[PDB]
Amino acid sequence: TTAHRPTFDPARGKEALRGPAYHQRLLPAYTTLKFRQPGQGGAADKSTRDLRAELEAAEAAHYAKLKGAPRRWDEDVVFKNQARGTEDKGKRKEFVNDLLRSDFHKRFMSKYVR
Amino acid sequence: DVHPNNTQLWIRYIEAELKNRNINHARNLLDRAVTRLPRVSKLWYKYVY
Amino acid sequence: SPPRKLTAEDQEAWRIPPPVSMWKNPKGFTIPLDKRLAADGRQLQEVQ
Amino acid sequence: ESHFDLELRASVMADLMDMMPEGIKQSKVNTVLQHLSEAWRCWKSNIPWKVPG
Amino acid sequence: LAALQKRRELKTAGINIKITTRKKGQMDYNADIPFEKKPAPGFYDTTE
RNA sequence: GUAAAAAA
RNA sequence: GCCCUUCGGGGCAUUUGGUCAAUUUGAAACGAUACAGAGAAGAUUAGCAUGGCCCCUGCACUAAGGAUGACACGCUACUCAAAGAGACGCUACCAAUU
């Protein structure tokens, strides 16, 4: 049954029809462009080597700021110290490029499937 | 117009003219085809043949 | 530029297997059962 | 969902046409889009997808 | 086939009429070469 | 039968 | 018509427009009637799309619907062989029971 089919030849864009103006399509809106003002930059080139210099200046400043550069009730029981080495999780957050094994997804499934 | 660079299509058209003895139509097609596709040696071989 | 010189081994290396779906059969074909189970790796799957 | 499928199929096809060496016969490429559909169904059913050859 | 038989019988027995099945929204491919693209002229004459 | 000249 | 005049003259105002008002032959369309008759590889069917010499309703020419609106389902040689193995191929047709 080939009624329900894929697309091998997707529709090609066309020049607009040309004719007299009667149908109203697109109501005017935001009819003024904003331009970059004094202090908003954009129209401010320094130079290639200048821009390079501020790039390593800013990046070295960030790196330097990161580095810091200016009989007992609990002895009756049978299992002991079973939660040592558990609260020490939380050194570095690892992004994992596999969604079904991410901590986000594990959290999601724990919260919602019970 | 739909398949400008199709060797099989160019050969079909050229052969239809040659089979029906339209030699001048066919040679015009052969010049057009080896202009269109100058690195397709099939069209060059057909033309020399 | 001049065409790439290919071998029959290049042609064989780019031939594509005919897809047998485990779910879809739009034409209602009767597929032999070995062909139906070829692409399953659960025959491959090893448990220790 | 219908639009996502259209975009996905166009992307996979463009990649395959650009991956194919010049001179390979290239009629059956819609075949690869059928393999793509089957692999997606295999992912949804958690069935390993492995086409021999 | 039945309409062809009836039309042949009418044409044999005299009256000739144009049974025209031409619908609303259909071209007349008999009437004219559709979307005609003539072969490009080349260096060879093709008038004969 | 509601939406195209001895195999409802 | 008016005005001016030096009584000879001069001035003011200046080119509309829609094929007739005429219904057979320069183009309206339903309904009734007749007929048939609703997608997805058993049965029943929620749909969402795709392409445009198919459109309809809608303000939507950046909704939504129209059976998922319909159409789709025919057809099917043509860039085209090579190896090695045969050929009473390519000619004639033929004299004893007792």
Would residue E3 be called left, alpha or beta, if left means φ above 0 and alpha means ψ between -120 and 50 degrees?
alpha
Q: Across the strands, what pairs with C40? A: D49
D49: helix, strand or coil: strand
* Interface present between D and E (3 or more CB pairs within 8 Å): no
| C36 touches C22 (CB < 8 A) | yes
Approach to solving: cryo-EM
Q: Which nucleotides of G are covered by protein (CB under 7 A)?
A: 39-42, 47-55, 61-62, 68, 71-73, 78-80
| D34 touches A6 (CB < 8 A) | no
- Is A10 touching D (CB cutoff 8 A)? yes
Q: Which of E43, A91, D1, D52 has the alpha carbon at shortest distance from B24?
A: E43
Q: Which residues contact A1 (CB under 8 A, 6 or more apart)?
A: C26
The resolution, in Å, is 2.8
Could you tell me the distance in Å between the CA of residue C9 and the C1' of nucleotide G85?
A: 30
The set of residues with CB closer than 7 Å to nucleic strand G is A 1-7, 9-12, 23, 25-26; B 7-8, 11-12, 15, 42; C 23-28; D 1-3, 6; E 25-27, 34-35
Q: Which residues contact C23 (CB under 8 A, 6 or more apart)?
A: D38, D41
| D42 touches D48 (CB < 8 A) | yes
Helices (H), chain A: 48-67, 103-112
**Chain D residue whose CA is closest to A7:** D6
Cα-atom radius of gyration of chain E, to the nearest Å?
19
Window 23-52 of D, Cβ < 8 Å to C: 23-25, 28-29, 31-32, 34-35, 37-38, 41-42, 47-52
Token match 């991956």: residue?
D19
d(Cα B1, Cα B9) in Å, to the nearest integer?
11
Are the beta carbons of E45 and B24 separated by less than 8 Å?
A: yes
| C9 touches D22 (CB < 8 A) | no
d(Cα D26, Cα D18) in Å, to the nearest integer?
11
Give B39's contacts in chain C (Cβ within 8 Å).
Answer: 1-3
Give B29's contacts in chain E (Cβ within 8 Å).
Answer: 39, 42
Element at B43 (helix H, strand E):
helix B41-48
d(Cα C14, Cα E6) in Å, to the nearest integer?
59
Helices (H), E1-48: 2-12
d(Cα E22, Cα C29) in Å, to the nearest integer?
40
Q: b/e map of A46-60 (b: 16 or more CB within 10 Å)?
A: eeeeeeeeeeeeeee
